[PDB]
Target: cytochrome C'
Amino acid sequence: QFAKPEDAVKYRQSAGTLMASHFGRMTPVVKGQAPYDAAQIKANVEVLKTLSALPWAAFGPGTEGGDARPEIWSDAASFKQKQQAFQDNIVKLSAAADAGDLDKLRAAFGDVGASCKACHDAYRKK
Amino acid sequence: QFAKPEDAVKYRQSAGTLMASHFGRMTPVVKGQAPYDAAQIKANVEVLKTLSALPWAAFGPGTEGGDARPEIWSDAASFKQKQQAFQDNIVKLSAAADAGDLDKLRAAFGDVGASCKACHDAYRKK
Ligand code: HEC
Ligand code: HEC
Model:
């Protein structure tokens, strides 16, 4: 869907921006600094679920640029493992949110955040 | 969820970027220049549905900036009418996509695009 590689870069960066907001806005809730409303969090994690499927198709052939490392493309199976594992982490977060289970939410949130960081550390330029 | 107004601006702009991609990538399909796969379009319109609910909460009190006009905030009921009418247009598009009805899709796509433009013309700086 991208006329030029620059359009794929713009897309995936914007998807990252929105994920960061929908993930990070739950930090105070996980920490107990903000109240836990199970329905609010369930709805927010749904949004995050949708968003977290979006970046990967915007690292398609010819879309090199931004702060994306070349290794994304030369090691396609390995990058794919990391995005699929991340989306698995999001499923765990969704399950926790859908159940209304705050302890589960805390734990799953930590594992999601670790997965974001592990991919950035390997595949995003500093 | 925004630490500073600039964070709300960044969010709503990124939501616009992603909507433009998920809306605009259907133009060739509507025009018949690309094939119509009902399941593909149904899934894409779902994504667009989720995205098209996101900008409005990022025009919250104190979030003035970017290319957003002041009138957004001073005329709150009227801006709200335009975003609610837009989301109604998206419901029509979803219904068309879910039914697999290309003629309905064409018509609903045109009305969505008109609604994007009408809001930008009134509320986005040039
Ligand atoms: C690899 C499998 C990733 C996972 C998992 C996550 N991110 Fe990511 N992210 C990735 C890359 C390769 C890039 C660079 C894209 C480019 O072309 O520049 C990014 C970028 C971001 C950004 C910055 C966007 C920008 O302003 O330029 C953000 C804010 C971001 N990513 C957030 C984010 C979050 C919160 C994630 C987990 C919920 C996450 N990413 C996972 C690769 C990968
Ligand atoms: C008002 C009810 C709007 C409707 C309906 C749509 N958009 Fe919008 N959009 C609106 C404003 C006020 C702004 C400016 C935000 C700012 O603070 O700068 C925007 C911006 C965009 C952008 C540009 C994002 C950027 O790169 O800075 C895009 C690409 C965009 N909008 C797309 C878009 C599409 C495709 C829409 C219909 C599907 C749509 N918008 C509707 C206000 C409103």
